Amino acid sequence: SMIKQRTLKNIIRATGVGLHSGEKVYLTLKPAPVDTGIVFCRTDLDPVVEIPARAENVGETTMSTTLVKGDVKVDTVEHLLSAMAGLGIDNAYVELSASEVPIMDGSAGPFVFLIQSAGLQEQEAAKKFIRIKREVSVEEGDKRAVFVPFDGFKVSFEIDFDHPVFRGRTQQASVDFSSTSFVKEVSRARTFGFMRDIEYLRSQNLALGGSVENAIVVDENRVLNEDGLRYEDEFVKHKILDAIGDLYLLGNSLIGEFRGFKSGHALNNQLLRTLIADKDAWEVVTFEDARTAPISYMRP
């Protein structure tokens, strides 16, 4: 069969708090028609404001990816979008009762569970992929984000924290997502931050909801969380999770390889913008036979 677009089989609901705003928020994921993409909807507003999860609607990229439209924003979309990308969800409405996606446990684990509990549904239209045809890159100082051609989907990342909990640890990871390894490899990797920063962050309306319940909190010489890491390389795996979600602002699954070096939401967005402008570097492809495609998907 052809590889088909996917949406949700049924409505999914979650409650939580925004990592940065601290605000309680209700999240409702709904099915959507073919070629809708992922669209966020602020249902605390009347009439609603709908913001497609697309690079063109990214505003700020300070400690999260923020979508903007008119006067209003949808903050911290990267972890939910990573779950959407990881599960191959093309079309969905994401209703929010406040301006920030709930952080849940700091990973995409709760989202992939909630979604897969309801199930996905294939739709009668070909799934469109963006295939990287030549290298595209952005740099800012020593930070770099690059797309290179690759027959599949692969993400590599390197961090470099001058911090005693990080020095001497691998801080590099490469994962091939051409098959169904997202859930096992990175979905449960939690966000992280530094206790030293918390007063500054809160003064900027950042991390107001952050705690050891939804983040790895790193002190000066130790991890504060008593219960332990989910992966020995959880920090760099979370950066890969962030990258997958930021990359999904292209609106389609990628056929290619991403490499990040000390990059973050701001540079990820700059990479998407220069890619979109560099039209000779990419094409849109479909697969009328799933068996000859370079990416495989699990059953809906």
Ligand SMILES: C[C@](CCn1ccc(-c2ccc(OCc3ccccc3)cc2F)cc1=O)(C(=O)NO)S(C)(=O)=O
């Ligand atoms: C990588 C990135 C990180 C996003 N993030 C995640 C967590 C925090 C954070 C920091 C400190 C803190 O202390 C709480 C505390 C507890 C006890 C005593 C004192 C303080 C609690 C927190 F939750 C900041 C932050 O910014 C991400 O995952 N984006 O999606 S980032 C850099 O790209 O934004």
Ligand SMILES: [Ca+2]
């Ligand atoms: Ca409100």
Ligand SMILES: [Ca+2]
């Ligand atoms: Ca240990």
Ligand SMILES: [Cl-]
């Ligand atoms: Cl707002």
Ligand SMILES: [Cl-]
């Ligand atoms: Cl950055």
Ligand SMILES: [Zn+2]
């Ligand atoms: Zn993150």
